[PDB]
Design a binder for this molecule. Structure first.
Ligand SMILES: Cn1cnc(S(=O)(=O)N(CCN(Cc2cncn2C)c2ccc(C#N)cc2)Cc2ccccc2)c1
Ligand SMILES: CC(C)=CCC/C(C)=C/CC/C(C)=C/COP(=O)(O)OP(=O)(O)O
Ligand SMILES: OC[C@@H]1O[C@@](CO)(O[C@H]2O[C@H](CO)[C@@H](O)[C@@H](O)[C@@H]2O)[C@@H](O)[C@H]1O
Ligand SMILES: OC[C@@H]1O[C@@](CO)(O[C@H]2O[C@H](CO)[C@@H](O)[C@@H](O)[C@@H]2O)[C@@H](O)[C@H]1O
Ligand SMILES: OC[C@@H]1O[C@@](CO)(O[C@H]2O[C@H](CO)[C@@H](O)[C@@H](O)[C@@H]2O)[C@@H](O)[C@H]1O
Ligand SMILES: O=S(=O)(O)C[C@@H](O)CNC1CCCCC1
Ligand SMILES: O=S(=O)(O)C[C@@H](O)CNC1CCCCC1
Ligand SMILES: O=S(=O)(O)C[C@H](O)CNC1CCCCC1
Ligand SMILES: [Zn+2]
Lengths: 313, 485
């Protein structure tokens, strides 16, 4: 049975404060006895701005019942800093939260704040934790964004070595080997190879990247991720489409095509062919493939491809 | 009207090809393709005259959805505690859904809605996810509360709009406390930085006439740098050290693309010099249309490349389409019509796949096999509204608005935090007020643009792009705060 906090001698001096809903509120929640009682005392603690161990314990009680309570998380971080608590211990508690399936924007943001403040000389162990976290949940948006922040923040401090960058690309390649249709891993690749300030972008480096993209396309021709990356790559580095066209042309009927269950044509291969015609100032030929996309090969987007066609004609 | 918007039933449904390369993504995709296509096979074609015998009827079950919303509007079970920090959203999802469904709330219930939300308003500025004595202000419930007051409130003393007017200075100050030098906003004190905050803040600031130069500084740069190589937008951009360069921090996602496109659009009506920094409109349009699923997945939208279709993206991605389209139109005119997405297929997804099975709880859902909820009810319907009606931003309507604007009428100007943070003078402030107000009311329903799949009984009301409230709510609300009534 639950022992009310009004009966606990540790809380005897605190007068609980009720939720101020006003008269007859809409969307009221039938809070459990535990949650209501905890919030009544949290309202009191926070109003008087108490920074104590019991207050810290109360915040943990609440976020376990409601991991999304942003007010309580904000108060918890204030408690950690005021009381000069071990930030490393709090990180381990956050690891326990993930294992116990307690998750939200708030937990990940809490981790970010902890790591910002700890500010380790080498963030390798946190990077490792993130990798392990991604394995069973390989497309978790928040986890991927946090990985971006971590490398971005710590790189500005000059704390990411070339070896560390190297092993990150290795890890990213393995994620794409395990699932070439993981768009999150393609996005990570873009950061590592193109967008990050330290990205290696010599002429042979761009050559290597094109080989990788084309090989990915030949492996999985219907992979929208690979096509989007190709198109984004060529556009970002102002590279002509025509010289690469021989590698794409077979999918409309440098590494070349070799695959069973590959019906032709591939819609995005046609978009490539069309844009390569526009590059050559061949607007009529471009309109013809847009028309084919509109009427025959990608009819879901009939209106869009017609729009693109009318842009030429 | 439907020449370039083919019905799902008129197209060949085939799985996404494997290329003999199995992966976890394809396993999940094939499973979803089966769930959706089988329901389509069980359901009568909404477009047919001879609605075939034995098949499920796909008509919009408006009364079932009204009941679903009514049943949890006055009491929520203990399990909803996970949304205790989001109660203004529960209000918004309900009252906006009812608006779309054409169901009126009586004045007594509206008064309750107003009262509930006003208790979420803290004196220091902004709304939180619960009462002011329980939760701190947050940009997201601020948007949800403000929009809900536009829907359920009025201009009388118990109507709530008066309270918003008096809170204008404090809400502005809360917005300024959230501001970061790089142009991002934290969602709350010690909170995360992302483009959802920017969107929510920009809507509220536009509606309440509290836009200043200092509020907007670098905001355009932050948003613009969220655009990824894919054409859509991520949650945030990182400023590499004023900054030497800004880099997107994640995948293009439907939710963040909606927020970014809408934020950008709101910024284009502020007459500041070299503002806003441009986005790649064509790439954003391309990304938007590419997220519409294949016939086998019912022509609903997915939120990111190689993920699964979901009814809520009908609003997030679908509702971004008219905004992206207008931006593309403006760019082409700056150098110098069929639908841009399949308006019919999207309606078919909603009617056939996103509705709860008949004779049950009602409500709309993510996809077959998923429980309906308030969030999906609201966003499915908002998307359905965008597909049903041809909403365009009209330059001639904006011009008409400019001609009727009265600059001698208005609420007191907000006092900037920094002495030079305001408008240079009164003329430039009034020109800004005019532009912001006139453009906010620029969205019109195109004559002859209506397509109601399954017949006129499926028709719901017209939501406004960017704001996501009915035009009949937006007009008197914004007119009140700009004194243009
Ligand atoms: C997959 N996804 C799509 N949108 C989001 S979100 O913008 O971050 N949002 C929705 C989270 N979300 C989960 C979700 C949405 N789409 C599918 N999922 C699993 C959700 C929120 C409320 C209800 C109810 N009633 C049901 C589901 C969180 C949120 C919570 C409260 C207020 C506002 C947003 C997540
Ligand atoms: C104004 C406002 C609050 C805007 C809402 C924006 C919104 C919809 C953002 C999306 C949030 C996101 C990163 C979750 C994806 O989860 P998921 O992996 O479960 O979904 P997915 O598989 O479809 O990507
Ligand atoms: O979280 C501890 C608390 O935060 C501070 C400011 O950092 O005050 C805020 O938190 C209180 C209590 O939640 C609220 O009144 C907020 O409005 C306020 O901004 C600080 O005073 C500290 O005690
Ligand atoms: O296989 C030929 C292919 O079929 C068409 C429709 O006639 O596309 C359908 O089949 C593909 C599977 O390859 C999917 O993308 C479906 O969504 C699409 O309906 C046509 O485009 C043609 O290329
Ligand atoms: O295009 C105008 C359209 O016609 C109406 C009937 O007045 O609906 C018909 O057209 C729709 C859309 O193509 C089909 O679903 C038919 O079943 C339906 O009869 C009307 O709803 C209006 O939108
Ligand atoms: O249009 S909805 O599906 O929302 C409404 C609905 O289901 C009610 N149908 C009743 C059933 C009994 C006879 C009278 C009509
Ligand atoms: O599109 S029209 O207005 O011409 C016709 C239309 O609304 C038909 N709705 C039916 C009527 C019978 C019950 C099921 C729904
Ligand atoms: O800032 S105001 O004076 O407007 C009101 C105020 O401070 C309320 N603080 C509560 C205390 C309990 C936890 C949530 C926040
Ligand atoms: Zn959803």
């Amino acid at each position: 049975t639950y022992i009310p906090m009004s009966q606990r001698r540790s809380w005897a001096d605190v007068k609980p404060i009720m939720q101020d809903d006003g008269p007859n509120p809409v969307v009221p929640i039938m809070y459990s006895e535990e949650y209501k009682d905890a919030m009544d005392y949290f309202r009191a603690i926070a109003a008087k701005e108490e920074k104590s161990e019991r207050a810290l314990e109360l915040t943990e009680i609440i976020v376990r019942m409601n991991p999304a309570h942003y007010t309580v998380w904000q108060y918890r971080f204030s408690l950690l800093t005021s009381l000069n608590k071990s930030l490393e211990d709090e990180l381990r508690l956050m690891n326990e939260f993930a294992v116990q399936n307690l998750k939200s924007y708030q937990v990940w943001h809490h981790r970010l704040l902890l790591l910002d403040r700890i500010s380790p000389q080498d963030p390798v162990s946190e990077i490792e934790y993130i990798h392990g976290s991604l394995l069973p949940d390989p497309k978790n948006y928040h986890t991927w964004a946090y990985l971006h922040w971590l490398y971005s923040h710590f790189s500005t401090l000059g704390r990411i070595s070339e070896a560390q960058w190297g092993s990150e690309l290795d890890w990213c390649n393995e994620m794409l080997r395990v699932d070439g249709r993981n768009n999150s891993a393609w996005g990570w690749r873009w950061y590592l190879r193109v967008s990050r300030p330290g990205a290696e972008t010599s002429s042979r480096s761009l050559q290597d990247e094109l080989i990788y993209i084309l090989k990915s396309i030949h492996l999985i021709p219907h992979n929208v991720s690979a096509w989007n990356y190709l198109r984004g790559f060529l556009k970002h580095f102002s590279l002509p489409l025509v010289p690469i066209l021989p590698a794409i042309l077979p999918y409309t009927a440098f590494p070349m095509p070799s695959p069973e269950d590959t019906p032709l044509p591939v819609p995005l291969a046609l978009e490539y062919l069309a844009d390569s015609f526009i590059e050559q100032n061949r607007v009529d030929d471009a309109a013809k493939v847009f028309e084919k996309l509109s009427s025959e090969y990608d009819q879901m987007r009939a209106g869009y491809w017609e729009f693109r066609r009318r842009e030429c004609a | 009207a439907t020449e370039f918007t083919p019905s799902v039933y008129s197209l060949v449904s085939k799985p996404l090809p494997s290329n003999s390369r199995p992966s976890a993504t394809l396993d999940e995709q094939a499973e979803t393709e089966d769930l959706i296509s089988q329901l389509f096979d069980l359901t009568a074609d909404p477009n047919a005259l001879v609605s075939e015998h034995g098949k499920r009827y796909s008509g919009l079950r408006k009364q079932e959805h009204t009941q679903f919303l009514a049943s949890s509007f006055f009491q929520l079970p203990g399990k909803f505690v996970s949304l205790d920090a989001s109660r203004p959203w529960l209000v918004f999802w309900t009252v906006h859904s009812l608006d779309l469904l054409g169901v009126a709330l009586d004045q007594g219930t509206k008064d309750r809605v107003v009262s509930t939300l006003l208790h979420f308003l803290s004196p220091k500025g902004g709304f939180g996810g619960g009462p002011a004595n329980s939760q701190i202000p947050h940009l997201l419930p601020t948007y949800a509360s403000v929009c809900s007051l536009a829907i359920a409130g009025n201009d009388s003393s118990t109507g709530g709009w008066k309270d918003l007017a008096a809170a204008r200075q404090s809400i502005y100050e809360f917005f300024m406390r959230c501001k970061r030098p790089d142009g991002g906003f934290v969602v709350c004190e010690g909170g995360e930085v992302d483009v959802r905050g920017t969107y929510c803040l920009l809507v509220v600031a536009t509606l309440l006439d509290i836009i200043t130069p200092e509020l907007l500084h670098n905001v355009d740069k932050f948003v613009s740098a969220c655009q990824t190589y894919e054409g859509g937008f991520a949650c945030a951009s990182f400023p590499f050290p004023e900054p030497s360069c800004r880099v997107s921090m994640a995948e293009a996602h439907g939710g963040y693309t909606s927020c970014s496109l809408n934020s950008h659009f709101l910024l284009t009506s502020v007459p500041l010099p070299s503002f806003p920094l441009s986005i790649d409109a064509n790439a954003a349009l391309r990304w938007t249309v590419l997220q519409q699923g294949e016939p086998i997945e019912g022509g609903g939208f997915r939120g990111r490349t190689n993920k699964l279709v979901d009814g809520c993206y009908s609003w997030w991605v679908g509702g971004g389409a008219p905004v992206a389209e207008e931006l593309v139109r403006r760019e082409k005119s700056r150098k110098v019509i069929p639908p841009i997405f399949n308006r019919v297929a999207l309606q078919e997804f909603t009617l056939v796949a996103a509705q709860q099975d008949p004779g049950s709880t009602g409500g709309l859902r993510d996809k077959p096999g998923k429980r309906p909820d308030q969030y999906h009810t609201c966003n499915n319907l908002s998307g359905l509204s965008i597909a049903q009606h041809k909403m365009s931003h009209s330059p001639s309507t904006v011009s008409s608005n400019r001609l009727k604007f009265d600059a001698s009428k208005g609420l007191p100007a907000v006092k900037p935090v920094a002495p030079g943070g305001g408008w240079k003078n009164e003329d430039e402030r009034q020109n800004a007020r005019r532009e912001i107000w006139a453009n906010a009311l620029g969205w019109i329903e195109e004559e002859g643009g209506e397509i109601i799949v399954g017949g006129k009984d499926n028709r719901i009301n017209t939501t406004t792009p960017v704001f996501n409230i009915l035009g009949l709510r937006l007009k008197p609300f914004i007119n009140y705060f700009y004194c243009q009534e």
